[PDB]
């Protein structure tokens, strides 16, 4: 992790709870990450969006 | 020095053997298609079938399909049910795929 | 010439025992036989300096046999510079690979110019029937200078004896002599200090 390589949270797009924490290079991947992850509250897979940490 | 044929044969067949299941190996010539089920631990063939054996007709795809059911027919009579399909150096397609679909029609579980 | 040597059989004697009885431990073999032998060290030496690995020694074995052998291997005591074991290769009627001496004929001109005949090979390894060992193989070195050379290709071989080393293998050469008038240049010779080989992100 550095200034360019940030830590970030993944928020379930449906119920809105952050379920995952990961990292990206916001110069290499300047867009908000969108990732299908398992959400344990919805208890199904859902698109997760990068949300500020 | 190995070929792309030999590396392929080795690669798919190494992964099959890792699973440890009996392998439905298929050989395919310009004319015929041959299939035997092999216990790799005893290094012994269990049951065989070929277009050259049953002296099957013409269209290689339907011929391969029938050697599949034939391989199945004798297979299940020997207690064989589950197996792993060894396409070796062949892409799962046409003739080799027809033999598979026919072998499954017989009741070979794979 | 053809040399002789009393030889004796051994079984369980220790080599060190044999070597303090003045006896040289040995072995005899070919594709048919293999026997542990010894040969009285003083008698062997007097034979080996005359009959290196080129000429035949016949071993008078104590069982009444007399077998024609070439010395195939002499193990020396690296510490004391003394023979410590001999391989006797028992010949049969079939061909064999062996070393045959090179007898350098003539006086090189580059040697008359001050040079030095560097005799890289004093024998050559050559396949030949045993009924047919040449005493040597003459070599004309008279027309060599500094720095000319000969090879096994230039070896003119007698009958029934074929080269068994690559004819591209140099055998003689004539180099310049040692000369004091080079010392001052070699003494006043700055040397760049050694270089370590770069490790890591430097290479």
């Amino acid at each position: 992790a550095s200034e360019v390589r940030i830590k970030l949270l993944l928020e379930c797009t449906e119920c809105k709870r952050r379920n995952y924490a990961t990292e990206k290079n916001k110069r290499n991947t300047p867009n908000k990450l969108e990732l299908r992850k398992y959400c344990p509250w919805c208890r199904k897979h859902t698109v997760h969006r990068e949300v500020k940490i | 020095r190995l070929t792309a044929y030999e590396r392929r044969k080795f690669r798919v067949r190494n992964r099959i053997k890792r699973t440890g299941r009996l392998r439905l190996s298929v050989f395919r010539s310009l004319k015929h298609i041959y299939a035997q089920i092999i216990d790799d631990e005893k290094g012994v063939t269990l049951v065989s079938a070929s277009s050259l054996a049953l002296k099957l007709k013409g269209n290689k795809t339907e011929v391969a399909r029938q050697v599949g059911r034939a391989l199945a027919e004798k297979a299940l009579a020997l207690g064989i049910k589950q197996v792993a399909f060894d396409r070796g150096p062949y892409k799962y397609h046409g003739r080799v795929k027809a033999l598979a679909e026919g072998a499954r029609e017989g009741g070979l579980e794979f | 010439m053809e040399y002789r040597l009393k030889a004796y059989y051994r079984e369980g004697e220790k080599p060190s025992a044999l070597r303090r009885a003045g006896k040289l431990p040995g072995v005899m073999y070919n594709r048919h036989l293999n026997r542990k032998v010894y040969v009285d060290l003083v008698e062997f030496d007097k034979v080996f300096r005359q009959a290196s690995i080129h000429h035949v020694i016949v071993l008078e074995l104590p069982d009444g046999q007399s077998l024609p052998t070439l010395v195939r291997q002499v193990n020396l005591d690296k510490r004391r510079r003394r023979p410590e074991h001999v391989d006797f290769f028992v010949l049969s009627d079939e061909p064999v690979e062996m070393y045959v001496p090179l007898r350098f004929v003539g006086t090189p001109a580059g040697v008359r110019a001050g040079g030095v005949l560097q005799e890289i090979h004093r024998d050559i390894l050559v396949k030949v029937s045993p009924r047919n060992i040449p005493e040597f193989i003459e070599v004309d070195v008279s027309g060599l200078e500094i720095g000319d050379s000969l090879h096994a290709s230039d070896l003119k071989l007698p009958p029934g004896v074929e080269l068994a080393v690559s004819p591209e293998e140099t055998i003689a050469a004539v180099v310049p002599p040692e000369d004091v008038e080079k010392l001052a240049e070699e003494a006043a010779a700055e040397v760049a200090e050694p270089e370590v080989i770069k490790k890591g992100k430097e290479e």
Partner: protein, 141 residues
Amino acid sequence: MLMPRRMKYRKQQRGRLKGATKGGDYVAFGDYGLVALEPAWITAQQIEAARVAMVRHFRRGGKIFIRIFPDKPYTKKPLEVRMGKGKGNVEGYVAVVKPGRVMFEVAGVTEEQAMEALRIAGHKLPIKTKIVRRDAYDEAQ
């Protein structure tokens, strides 16, 4: 004078001097050799001294063969320092030499010339030596 053109490492550990020579124990090139009778680190300066003495006796003629190379870096701390604070500076190179080695051979010269040059060479060396003649045992090697 003799020393590696280059090396993978600058500083070798000291090692031992036990045993007879590994190899180099037979006259392999010339007509007479100078054989080492006891172990030592032979420095480059020693080797060069022994060479120069042999060419200087030969005046002009003959060929000297040097069959030892000083590749071991020899290190020494600067004077009047304490122990510690790292390994000393490489100050020379030596050739490990063990009983049996043939350090030098000669060719192209009378027997008296080789016996004498090789004797003078021995005096320059930090050890005992013998003078050997190329033998049939040497040829059989």
